Design an enzyme around this catalytic site. Structure first.
Site, PDB file in Angstrom:
ATOM      1  N   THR A 215       0.776  -1.181  -0.141  1.00  0.00           N
ATOM      2  CA  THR A 215      -0.077  -0.106   0.032  1.00  0.00           C
ATOM      3  C   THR A 215       1.011   1.318  -0.020  1.00  0.00           C
ATOM      4  O   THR A 215       1.839   1.267   0.757  1.00  0.00           O
ATOM      5  CB  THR A 215      -1.060   0.083   1.119  1.00  0.00           C
ATOM      6  OG1 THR A 215      -2.198  -1.028   1.057  1.00  0.00           O
ATOM      7  CG2 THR A 215      -1.471   1.407   1.247  1.00  0.00           C
TER       8      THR A 215
ATOM      9  N   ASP B 152      -3.138   4.214  -3.423  1.00  0.00           N
ATOM     10  CA  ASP B 152      -3.339   3.277  -4.439  1.00  0.00           C
ATOM     11  C   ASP B 152      -4.569   2.436  -4.197  1.00  0.00           C
ATOM     12  O   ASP B 152      -5.593   2.838  -3.219  1.00  0.00           O
ATOM     13  CB  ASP B 152      -2.035   2.274  -4.449  1.00  0.00           C
ATOM     14  CG  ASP B 152      -1.833   1.273  -3.580  1.00  0.00           C
ATOM     15  OD1 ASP B 152      -1.817   1.486  -2.566  1.00  0.00           O
ATOM     16  OD2 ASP B 152      -2.138   0.092  -3.981  1.00  0.00           O
TER      17      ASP B 152
ATOM     18  N   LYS C 190      -9.117   2.736  -0.216  1.00  0.00           N
ATOM     19  CA  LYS C 190      -8.437   3.210   0.903  1.00  0.00           C
ATOM     20  C   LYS C 190      -8.671   4.372   1.296  1.00  0.00           C
ATOM     21  O   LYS C 190      -8.114   4.763   2.497  1.00  0.00           O
ATOM     22  CB  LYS C 190      -6.796   2.945   0.429  1.00  0.00           C
ATOM     23  CG  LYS C 190      -6.708   1.492   0.192  1.00  0.00           C
ATOM     24  CD  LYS C 190      -5.086   1.232  -0.063  1.00  0.00           C
ATOM     25  CE  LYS C 190      -4.653   0.045  -0.972  1.00  0.00           C
ATOM     26  NZ  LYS C 190      -3.300  -0.251  -0.960  1.00  0.00           N
TER      27      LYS C 190
ATOM     28  N   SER D 267       3.501   0.119   2.546  1.00  0.00           N
ATOM     29  CA  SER D 267       4.873  -0.693   2.038  1.00  0.00           C
ATOM     30  C   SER D 267       5.557   0.107   0.885  1.00  0.00           C
ATOM     31  O   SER D 267       6.741   0.018   0.817  1.00  0.00           O
ATOM     32  CB  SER D 267       4.476  -1.969   1.546  1.00  0.00           C
ATOM     33  OG  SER D 267       3.282  -1.970   0.490  1.00  0.00           O
TER      34      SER D 267
ATOM     35  N   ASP E  41       6.672  -0.556  -5.724  1.00  0.00           N
ATOM     36  CA  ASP E  41       6.486  -1.612  -4.596  1.00  0.00           C
ATOM     37  C   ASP E  41       5.328  -2.267  -5.088  1.00  0.00           C
ATOM     38  O   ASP E  41       4.433  -2.263  -5.705  1.00  0.00           O
ATOM     39  CB  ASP E  41       5.779  -0.630  -3.448  1.00  0.00           C
ATOM     40  CG  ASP E  41       5.199  -1.525  -2.470  1.00  0.00           C
ATOM     41  OD1 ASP E  41       5.810  -2.540  -2.277  1.00  0.00           O
ATOM     42  OD2 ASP E  41       4.302  -1.117  -1.930  1.00  0.00           O
TER      43      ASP E  41
HETATM   44  C1  LIG Z   1      -5.241  -1.372   4.438  1.00  0.00           C
HETATM   45  C2  LIG Z   1      -5.641  -2.207   3.325  1.00  0.00           C
HETATM   46  C3  LIG Z   1      -6.887  -1.795   2.404  1.00  0.00           C
HETATM   47  C4  LIG Z   1      -4.271  -2.157   2.239  1.00  0.00           C
HETATM   48  C5  LIG Z   1      -3.394  -3.006   2.146  1.00  0.00           C
HETATM   49  N1  LIG Z   1      -3.455  -4.349   3.183  1.00  0.00           N
HETATM   50  C6  LIG Z   1      -3.522  -5.268   2.589  1.00  0.00           C
HETATM   51  O1  LIG Z   1      -3.737  -5.516   1.580  1.00  0.00           O
HETATM   52  C7  LIG Z   1      -3.676  -6.377   3.649  1.00  0.00           C
HETATM   53  C8  LIG Z   1      -2.438  -7.026   3.837  1.00  0.00           C
HETATM   54  C9  LIG Z   1      -2.488  -7.837   5.146  1.00  0.00           C
HETATM   55  C10 LIG Z   1      -2.209  -7.058   6.236  1.00  0.00           C
HETATM   56  C11 LIG Z   1      -2.264  -7.991   7.666  1.00  0.00           C
HETATM   57  C12 LIG Z   1      -2.174  -9.280   7.492  1.00  0.00           C
HETATM   58  C13 LIG Z   1      -2.393  -9.896   6.234  1.00  0.00           C
HETATM   59  C14 LIG Z   1      -2.478  -9.183   5.128  1.00  0.00           C
HETATM   60  N2  LIG Z   1      -4.622  -7.230   3.089  1.00  0.00           N
HETATM   61  C15 LIG Z   1      -5.934  -7.485   3.661  1.00  0.00           C
HETATM   62  O2  LIG Z   1      -6.426  -6.610   4.556  1.00  0.00           O
HETATM   63  C16 LIG Z   1      -6.902  -8.389   3.088  1.00  0.00           C
HETATM   64  C17 LIG Z   1      -8.233  -8.210   3.134  1.00  0.00           C
HETATM   65  N3  LIG Z   1      -9.215  -8.840   2.764  1.00  0.00           N
HETATM   66  C18 LIG Z   1      -8.813 -10.025   2.234  1.00  0.00           C
HETATM   67  C19 LIG Z   1      -7.486 -10.427   1.941  1.00  0.00           C
HETATM   68  N4  LIG Z   1      -6.639  -9.504   2.286  1.00  0.00           N
HETATM   69  B1  LIG Z   1      -2.092  -2.119   2.842  1.00  0.00           B
HETATM   70  O3  LIG Z   1      -1.897  -1.382   3.794  1.00  0.00           O
HETATM   71  O4  LIG Z   1      -0.710  -2.804   1.793  1.00  0.00           O
END
Ligand SMILES: CC(C)C[C@H](NC(=O)[C@H](Cc1ccccc1)NC(=O)c1cnccn1)B(O)O
Ligand SMILES: CC(C)C[C@H](NC(=O)[C@H](Cc1ccccc1)NC(=O)c1cnccn1)B(O)O
EC number: 3.4.25.1
Lengths: 233, 250, 196, 222, 244, 243, 204, 244
Positions: free
Chosen positions: D1, D17, D33, D129, D166
């Site tokens: 992200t 993003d 987001k 990230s 990234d």
């Molecule tokens: C905050 C969200 C919307 C944006 C991005 N986060 C994710 O993609 C996170 C990555 C993550 C974080 C902690 C534990 C496991 C996985 N993915 C998810 O939250 C997620 C949600 N629904 C289905 C599958 N994954 B990020 O900040 O890189």
């Protein structure tokens, strides 16, 4: 008047009286007479025990609280059991935590504060008993009078219960003599038995009818009843 | 200390009346008139700003409150009782609905919640019933426009039009003559202003009268742009100026 | 982090670097580690950013409530509140805090509260990862009853040395001047302090 | 992200993003987001997706109730305080990392919040990230006194840094602009530089391809 | 109707709380006690009615210390006073614990005040049956207070409560007029002894015992101490001589 | 039946006698107070009556500093007044901690009116026999006066007055505002606005004041403070050079 | 160890032209051991369809929970819950167990009865909503499903075509997963009717 | 204390009756009459809307007939708000059962529970009882169509036909006369409308003053349907039966 303000301990009368407390005080007067007095070396409790029938026991009036402290009761006996028990615990706490024998004065203040809580809150009741507390602590011999109102007084001598006014006038008269009766236990008790006999009317004080207690300098609080009080009749 | 009033203060009398609820309704009767009218494309609620001093600023005391973007309330009876019911109504709309379906509750259900809060004041230990009657007006997608009355007992009923408080009996009668099922919102605002003039003793202007509607969505009132499905609250409080404009065609 | 507070003739000055790090990444290079808990009572924060903020917010709350009831709190009272929080929650906090305040009756005072939550009242105090490197310099250069200009110079030189050696310290040197006059904010940029 | 925030002369801008991932897998090519706390306080979230949605909605709800209770527009410092105290309470376990921005009756504001409950103030910020790609851009092109247009460019460029460099970030750019005198403008899919090229073939199957064993009509009505 | 005086938190039609007013009656029925503020401290004194020869002299102490720097004296239900002081002691410990400095007297006054006022908010409690005279020395001088069963309290140049409150108040008022330049610690003690002897006439039937305590910046360093032996006897004499 | 006059349940007339009797208690102290708004200040004046010579005049006050920006004057018995003061302080400090800005005058007012409403509904709590006048220069609404009663009612005022002789002052002030046509006092300095308030306190009550008969609180941007006896005298001197 | 890999199981949903489709496999296993080949992972409340993958005990529990809540909803609201609304009810219900979550991968499919607009969504175990316009995938063969879908899918497919697509997507993903298969069922949801078909597939 | 103001809602009269239950019952007797009639092929619920106006929106209205289940429904006589509290808990209980056993709750089980909640308010907690009487209409696969009644006492009984609220005695007499075991739903519909029409305390029985419902095994399904009659449907069926 009175009838409207004596419903519970939470109510003041228009003259600032608390009738429930005054009613508790009446249970003391209806109780059997007990006397306490002290020199600079000893303190003595004498109590007239009451029976129900000639087939009944005479109900005990003297409770021990610690090795250096005990009390006599006039009024509701169960209330004295509750209060002596609390005192027993306080005496006990002082020893365990501080390795300290509880000051008789301090026991006085504790009993005052415990009684008080029941004179200001709803659903509670005053205690219906008077207590005479004797002990020997780091400042010598002591006698205390406890009233269910919470009032605790240190004295050389006193009596509570029915016809107690007799002994009280005797002690008030004898004051200068007994305060000096140091290092002689049997003479202080004699003065106490003489005090208590100034409150007799109904019958004489007999062998299983007398109860005496003593504490002092090198004497742990000990209870005398029956045969063991014979030499004082 | 400690609330030791764990018993009902409202009980049944031998005739079967619930005394405190009756007495509360009596308090409602002394209250300033308020009213609601339901049009085909909107609802209007109105009441009189009965200021307690000419030194008081009557804008600092709103009698018409927003509950959700599509639901508004007004009352007759005890003002402070109303105020706390508004706080609670607003909160329960969130805790029991928004936080669960991601949308605001339909009118009937929010009413249903308010009514419950009032019912409880009728039964719980150590309380008195609320001394108010509310009129709640709102809109939702599936039920459309809808007006509700809530009474101290906790009962509620849907209305085409009604009035509560001081001159309710006269005002209710005046509404029975004037109401039809083809009323446009502007027509209803007109009926509302006429009906309320009978109740008002003194001055009758946009400063004395407090009036609100549930009509079209107001995108200009949203505060942001960019989400097509957020088309703006349907609840709108009319300005002093907007009232006076309609009092000249009165 | 490099933080210090120094008592002098007219009052007390607080100094700090402006670096917050997550590992070797500088998460914030313009951090303000000099935090106000009352008009003339401030603190220097080191340790956990989250912990120190949450602590500082609680203290400010307490002192505001203190002022409403009792009037201006003493620096010692401020230090006590800090201590109580740091001590009673020692198992879940990583907060190294310096408390400094100006009072009219005690002039300038400095209290340091290290990890376990003990309190130490000193003429001056240093703390933070960077402080280790200036124990020698500070012990040799500190005098009591210095002037404002002298004191600004002591902090400036001390922290620039700490910034130089410690990777966890850096950015700008911030100071806060506490006297009868008032509250003064000072800032010194790398181009000045690096070449000392 | 990759999430960023950038102050300009008359307000504040945030952007993000639209990629969500579990391990190496892109779960969502176009999630949002950017969150609305109130009409003029918006929030960019990174970390655990459920967590940023929840913490954002909870405080949003409570901010709304506060506003109604006080007859005032919500202030950014209020959302800031409530979020940080909530996250602090959960020692980090609520994996929300937030850039919170908005306009209110005290001016324009930009803050960051980390999962353990620490807050920062800046003219320009980034988290996620993609945080380092984007910060590299910000540290390179930011100046004081940016116009609204220069700010959108700067913010949008920062996320692109994240998108391209990234693997934790990708797809599109969402923006929200909060100007002191105006309505907040949310600008969903402001850039879409990652449109999938037309496939080489259609995989539409001749009907009857799939073997069926048994069939039945389902009752939906009552 | 009536019954407005049977329940504690109830307002009468004229906005009074009769139960509190009834508590005041128990106070008026009590021993007289007083406080004099001086140029750098405070002096407390009280009448102890000798009910009998059997009461050990000097023993049944009535004045109470709170923390190290505060004296308290009260008239009315003695146990009620002990209860209040118990609370005051908790109230002060809590303050010292969090803030490190000993509790300022104005701060301590409100602590007692709020507590006493709390006992006029519910019918499940009874109002306090004492008026309390208390004070000490803090960061900015000497403070003297008196607190009523309603929870009302103000600062005082001099204060009295109980049976002889009128004699005492009259005696206190003269001192205020003949000494505008501020009494001294030693003088206020002699004066205290006099005032109690003079309110003792409203109860001259039963003997009595005198008790004095003081807290002075110069004389007790700020700490509350009892007046004993020579200084007590010297105070007794001054009063015994000025009774004739 | 007759208990509808002892706890806060409705009477057959739909009234709450205990609330009504609480309003009665507010006048027990026989003190009058008034509040006016300046251009950028808010002033409260209250009578100061020290009957007993044994009192320490400096401790006799019905004005409270709730927070750095909020002041509150009370009409009613002191113990209830202080109870309300303590609560308001606590509520003000807590608001700032939780929401990160200073509690507005009107919001605190609403909050205290809400607590008062509760004593109106729950049997075990009595109302406080007091009326609370809150004053500040709000950072959003400017000079501000909000007043709350034992009914849990509250509103904002252009100016207000409270006490046994409330009406005298009210009508006086009402007349000025019909004349001046604006909703505040046109004055740039808090010193003149204090003076206006004392002047109209004198006209409406028909009584002259010394420096020890009054008690004044002033609220400006970011402070609320109270004037000393000597600050009052300076105000009293200035009005005399005109009469 | 991994509660999401004990029983095994896949669910996939797609949008088409004025239609939606949702499919699952039928296997219920206990590690390597196949236990049941009749374990359906699609449920429906009114016209709203929900598939759940993951730990079977939580699959069953959550169905019973949503039946319960949608019943109450319908009684109060006097209308059937809509796909948009239900999605929110799933999310808030899952997040409610944030630190002791249900080990499931829910999937919502349906057509809004008022608007006709096709709707699908997917969730993580703690309630994060993924609302795709194209397809949602869930289960122990989600990687395989993403691959099949990302290639096989195209917009605006007719119910009969969408059927062929989603069936191939599921079948071929399942056959690369040891823990998925043993039968398969596909729902074709149109405003008016819902057709349910059991597919023929490998039984190993 | 509080004891003074306690009405003691849960004591016996000297005659061994419960005051509050009796007075609640007295309140119920003024409420719009509700009638329940069970037939062999279904059940009927009918109720008179107490007090009406031209402006009362009947299309959006519900005050007497509530759906508890897909197979159970109730008619209310008494306080609507009290009824809603009870109705909501009843809906929950039904769902709890359905979740536990995967079977719809047998009608009696639900009725017994609601009756138990009412009984509790009669024996402890010092609260007023709910001013509600229920007629329950339901179907289950053990007993078929069932009709029950519960009141503020928490007593419940089963009936072939019954009434609650105003004029029950007259209505009960009328139902006793014309009811026959071999009845059809359509005959039951007519009986309910006749009976209400003969007991109204209003001039005439119009559609706008009624709520109507049927539980039928509607034979073409081989499953049970709850029909809450819309205002127009009542107006129609009122004409057919010959009341216009
Ligand atoms: C905050 C969200 C919307 C944006 C991005 N986060 C994710 O993609 C996170 C990555 C993550 C974080 C902690 C534990 C496991 C996985 N993915 C998810 O939250 C997620 C949600 N629904 C289905 C599958 N994954 B990020 O900040 O890189
Ligand atoms: C007081 C804070 C703001 C300043 C510095 N703390 C941090 O940078 C700490 C780590 C640290 C480093 C060295 C020594 C101790 C702890 N970093 C954080 O707290 C942090 C970093 N990123 C986001 C949120 N918080 B420090 O004391 O070195």
């Amino acid at each position: 008047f009175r009838n409207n303000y004596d419903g519970d301990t939470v109510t003041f009368s228009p003259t600032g009286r608390l009738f429930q407390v005054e009613y508790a005080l009446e249970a003391i007067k209806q109780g059997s007479v007990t006397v306490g007095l002290r020199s600079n070396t000893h303190a003595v409790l004498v109590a007239l025990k009451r029976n129900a029938d000639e087939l009944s026991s005479y109900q005990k009036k003297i409770i021990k609280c610690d090795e250096h402290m005990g009390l006599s009761l006039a009024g509701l006996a169960p209330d004295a059991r509750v209060l002596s028990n609390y005192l027993r615990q306080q005496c006990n706490y002082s020893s365990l935590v501080f390795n300290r024998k509880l000051a008789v004065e301090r026991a006085g203040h504790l009993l005052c504060d415990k009684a008080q809580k029941n004179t200001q809150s709803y659903g509670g009741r005053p205690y219906g008993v008077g207590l005479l507390i004797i002990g020997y602590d780091k400042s010598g011999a002591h006698l205390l009078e406890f009233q269910p109102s919470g009032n605790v007084t240190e004295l050389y001598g006193t009596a509570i219960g029915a016809r107690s006014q007799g002994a009280k006038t005797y002690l008030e008269r004898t004051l200068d003599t007994f305060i000096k009766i140091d290092g002689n236990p049997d003479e202080l008790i004699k003065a106490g038995v003489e005090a208590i006999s100034q409150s007799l009317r109904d019958e004489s004080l007999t062998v299983d009818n007398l109860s005496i207690a003593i504490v002092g300098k090198d004497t742990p609080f000990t209870i005398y009843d029956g045969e063991a009080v014979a030499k004082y009749i | 200390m400690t609330d030791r009033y764990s018993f009902s203060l409202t009980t049944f009398s031998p005739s079967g009346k619930l005394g405190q609820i009756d007495y509360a309704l009596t308090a409602v009767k002394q209250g300033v008139t308020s009213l609601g009218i339901k049009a085909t494309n909107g609802v209007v609620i109105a009441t009189e700003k009965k200021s307690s001093s000419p030194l008081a600023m009557s804008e600092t005391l709103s009698k018409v409150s927003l509950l959700t973007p599509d639901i508004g309330a007004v009352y007759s009876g005890m003002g402070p009782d109303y105020r706390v019911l508004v706080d609670k109504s607003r909160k329960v709309a969130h805790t029991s609905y928004k936080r669960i379906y991601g949308e605001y509750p339909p009118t009937k259900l929010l009413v249903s919640e308010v009514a419950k809060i009032m019912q409880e004041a009728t039964q719980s230990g150590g309380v008195r019933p609320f001394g108010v009657s509310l009129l709640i007006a709102g809109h939702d997608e599936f039920n459309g426009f809808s007006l509700y009355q809530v009474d101290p007992s906790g009962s509620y009923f849907p209305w085409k039009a009604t009035a509560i408080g001081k001159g309710s009996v006269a005002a209710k009668t005046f509404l029975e003559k004037r109401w039809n099922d083809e009323l446009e919102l502007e027509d209803a605002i007109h009926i509302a202003l006429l009906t309320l003039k009978e109740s008002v003793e003194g001055e009758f202007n946009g400063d004395t009268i407090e009036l609100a509607i549930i009509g079209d969505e107001n995108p200009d009132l949203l505060g942001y742009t960019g989400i097509p499905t957020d088309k703006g609250p349907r609840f709108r409080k009319l300005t002093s100026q907007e009232i006076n404009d309609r009092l000249e065609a009165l | 982090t490099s933080i210090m507070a120094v008592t002098f003739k007219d009052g007390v000055i607080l100094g700090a670097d402006s670096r917050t790090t997550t590992g070797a990444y500088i998460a914030n290079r313009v951090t303000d580690k000099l935090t106000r808990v009352h008009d003339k009572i401030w603190c220097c924060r080191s340790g956990s950013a989250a912990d120190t903020q949450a602590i500082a917010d609680i203290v400010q709350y307490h002192l505001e409530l203190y002022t409403s009831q009792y009037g201006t709190p003493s620096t010692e009272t401020a230090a006590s509140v800090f201590k109580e929080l740091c001590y009673e929650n020692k198992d879940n906090l990583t907060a190294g805090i310096i408390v400094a305040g100006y009072d009219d009756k005690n002039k300038g005072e400095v209290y340091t509260i290290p990890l376990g939550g003990s309190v130490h009242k000193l003429p001056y105090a240093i703390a933070g990862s960077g402080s280790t490197f200036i124990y020698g310099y500070c012990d040799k250069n500190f005098r009591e009853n210095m002037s404002k200009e002298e004191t600004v110079d002591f902090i400036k030189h001390s922290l620039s040395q700490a910034i130089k050696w410690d990777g966890s310290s850096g950015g700008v040197i911030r100071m806060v001047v506490l006297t009868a006059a008032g509250v003064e904010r000072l800032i010194f940029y790398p181009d000045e302090y690096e070449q000392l | 992200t990759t999430i960023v925030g950038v102050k300009f002369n008359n307000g504040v801008v945030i952007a993000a993003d639209t990629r969500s991932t579990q391990g190496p897998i892109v779960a969502d090519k176009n999630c949002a987001k950017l969150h609305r706390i109130s009409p003029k306080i918006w929030c960019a979230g990174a970390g655990t997706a459920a967590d940023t949605e929840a913490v954002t909605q909870l405080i949003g709800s409570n901010i709304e109730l506060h506003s109604l209770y006080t007859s005032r527009e919500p202030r950014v410092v209020s959302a800031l305080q409530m979020l940080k105290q909530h996250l602090f309470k959960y020692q980090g376990h609520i994996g929300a990392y937030l850039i919170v921005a908005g306009v209110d009756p005290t001016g324009s504001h930009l803050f960051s919040i980390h999962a353990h409950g620490s807050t920062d103030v800046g003219y320009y910020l980034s988290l996620g990230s993609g945080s380092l790609a984007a910060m590299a851009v910000l540290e390179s092109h930011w100046k004081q006194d940016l116009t609204k247009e220069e700010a959108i460019k700067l913010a949008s460029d920062a996320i692109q840094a994240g998108i391209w460099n990234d693997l934790g970030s990708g797809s599109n750019v969402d923006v929200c602009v909060m100007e002191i005198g105006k309505d907040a403008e949310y600008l969903r899919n402001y850039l879409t530089p990652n449109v999938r090229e037309e496939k080489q073939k259609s995989y539409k199957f001749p009907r009857g391809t799939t073997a069926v064993l048994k069939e039945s009509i389902v009752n939906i009505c009552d | 109707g009536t019954g407005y005086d049977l329940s504690n938190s109830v307002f009468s039609p004229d906005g009074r709380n009769f139960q509190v007013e009834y508590a005041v009656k128990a106070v008026e029925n009590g021993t007289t006690s007083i406080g004099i503020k001086c140029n750098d401290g405070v002096v407390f004194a009280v009448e102890k009615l000798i009910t009998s020869k059997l009461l050990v002299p000097q023993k049944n102490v009535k004045i109470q210390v709170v923390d190290r720097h505060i004296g308290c004296v009260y008239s009315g239900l003695i146990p009620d006073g002990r209860h209040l002081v118990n609370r005051g002691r908790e109230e002060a410990a809590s303050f010292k614990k969090l803030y490190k400095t000993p509790i300022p007297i104005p701060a301590f006054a409100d602590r007692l005040g709020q507590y006493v006022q709390a006992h006029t908010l519910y019918n499940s409690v009874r109002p306090f049956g004492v008026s309390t005279i208390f004070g000490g020395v803090d960061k900015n001088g000497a403070h003297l207070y008196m607190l009523e069963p309603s929870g009302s309290y103000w600062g005082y140049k001099g204060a009295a409560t109980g049976k002889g409150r009128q004699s005492a108040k009259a005696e206190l008022e003269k001192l205020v007029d003949h000494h505008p330049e501020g009494l001294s610690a030693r003088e206020a003690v002699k004066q205290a002894a006099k005032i109690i002897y003079l309110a003792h006439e409203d109860n001259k039937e039963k003997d009595f015992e005198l008790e004095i305590s003081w807290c002075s910046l110069s004389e007790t360093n700020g700490l509350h101490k009892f007046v004993k032996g020579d200084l007590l006897q010297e105070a007794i004499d001054f009063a015994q001589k000025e009774i004739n | 039946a007759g208990y509808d006059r002892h706890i806060t349940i409705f009477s057959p007339e739909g009234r709450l006698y205990q609330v009504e009797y609480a309003f009665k208690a507010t006048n027990q102290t026989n003190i009058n107070s008034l509040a006016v708004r300046g251009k950028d200040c808010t002033v409260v004046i209250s009578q100061k009556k020290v009957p007993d010579k044994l009192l320490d005049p400096t401790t006799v006050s019905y004005i409270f500093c709730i927070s750095r920006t909020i002041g509150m004057v009370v009409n009613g018995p002191i113990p209830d007044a202080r109870n309300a003061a303590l609560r308001a302080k606590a509520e003000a400090a807590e608001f700032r901690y939780k929401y990160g800005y200073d509690m507005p005058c009107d919001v605190l007012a609403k909050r205290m009116a809400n607590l008062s409403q509760i004593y109106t509904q729950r049997a075990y709590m009595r109302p406080l026999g007091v009326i609370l006048t809150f004053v500040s220069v709000d950072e959003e609404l400017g000079p501000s006066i909000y007043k709350t009663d034992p009914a849990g009612y509250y509103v904002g005022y252009k100016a207000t007055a409270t006490g046994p002789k409330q009406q005298e002052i009210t009508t006086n002030l009402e007349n000025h505002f019909k004349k001046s046509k604006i909703d505040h006092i046109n004055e740039e300095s808090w010193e003149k606005v204090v003076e206006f308030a004392i002047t109209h306190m004198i006209d409406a009550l028909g009584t002259e004041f010394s420096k020890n008969d009054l008690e004044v609180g002033v609220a400006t941007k970011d402070k609320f403070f109270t004037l000393s006896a000597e600050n009052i005298e300076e105000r009293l001197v200035a009005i005399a050079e005109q009469d | 160890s991994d509660p999401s890999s004990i029983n095994g199981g896949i669910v996939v949903a797609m949008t088409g032209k004025d239609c939606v489709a949702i499919a699952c496999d039928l296997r219920l296993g206990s590690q390597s051991l196949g236990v049941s080949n009749k374990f359906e992972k699609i449920f429906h409340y009114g016209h709203v369809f929900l598939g759940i993958t993951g730990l079977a005990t939580d699959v069953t529990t959550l169905n019973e929970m949503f039946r319960y809540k949608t019943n109450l909803y319908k009684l109060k609201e006097e209308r059937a819950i809509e796909p948009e609304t239900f999605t929110q009810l799933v999310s808030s219900s899952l997040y409610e167990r944030r630190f002791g979550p249900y080990f499931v991968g829910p999937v919502v499919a349906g057509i809004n009865s008022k608007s006709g607009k096709p709707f699908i969504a997917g969730f993580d175990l703690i309630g994060c909503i993924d609302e795709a316009k194209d397809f949602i995938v869930s289960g122990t063969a989600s990687d395989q499903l993403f691959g099949m879908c990302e290639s096989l899918y195209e917009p605006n497919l007719e119910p009969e075509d969408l059927f062929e697509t989603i069936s191939q997507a599921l079948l071929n993903a399942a056959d690369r997963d040891a823990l998925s298969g043993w039968g398969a069922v596909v729902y074709i949801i149109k405003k008016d009717e819902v057709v349910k078909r059991y597919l023929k597939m490998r039984q190993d | 204390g509080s004891r003074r103001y306690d009405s003691r809602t849960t004591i016996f009269s000297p005659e061994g009756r419960l005051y509050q239950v009796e007075y609640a019952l007295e309140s119920i007797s003024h409420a719009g009459t509700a009638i329940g009639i069970m037939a062999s092929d279904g059940i009927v619920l009918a109720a008179e809307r107490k007090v009406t106006s031209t402006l009362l929106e009947q299309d959006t209205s519900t005050e007497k007939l509530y759906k508890l289940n897909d197979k159970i429904a109730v008619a209310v006589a008494g306080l609507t708000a009290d009824a809603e509290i009870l109705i909501n808990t009843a809906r929950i209980h039904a769902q709890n059962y359905l979740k536990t056993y995967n079977e719809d709750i047998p009608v009696e089980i639900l009725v017994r529970r609601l009756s138990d909640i009412k009984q509790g308010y009669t024996q402890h907690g010092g609260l007023r009882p709910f001013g509600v009487s229920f007629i329950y209409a339901g179907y289950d696969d053990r007993y078929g169509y069932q009709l029950y009644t519960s009141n503020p006492s928490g007593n419940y009984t089963g009936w072939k036909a019954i009434s609650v609220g105003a004029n029950t005695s007259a209505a009960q007499t009328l139902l006793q006369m014309d009811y026959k075991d071999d009845m059809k739903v359509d005959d039951a519909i007519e009986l309910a409308l006749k009976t209400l029409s003969k007991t109204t305390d209003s001039s005439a029985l119009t559609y706008d003053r009624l709520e109507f419902a049927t539980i039928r095994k509607g034979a073409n399904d081989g499953e049970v349907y709850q029909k809450i009659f819309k205002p127009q449907e009542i107006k129609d069926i009122l004409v057919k039966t010959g009341i216009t």
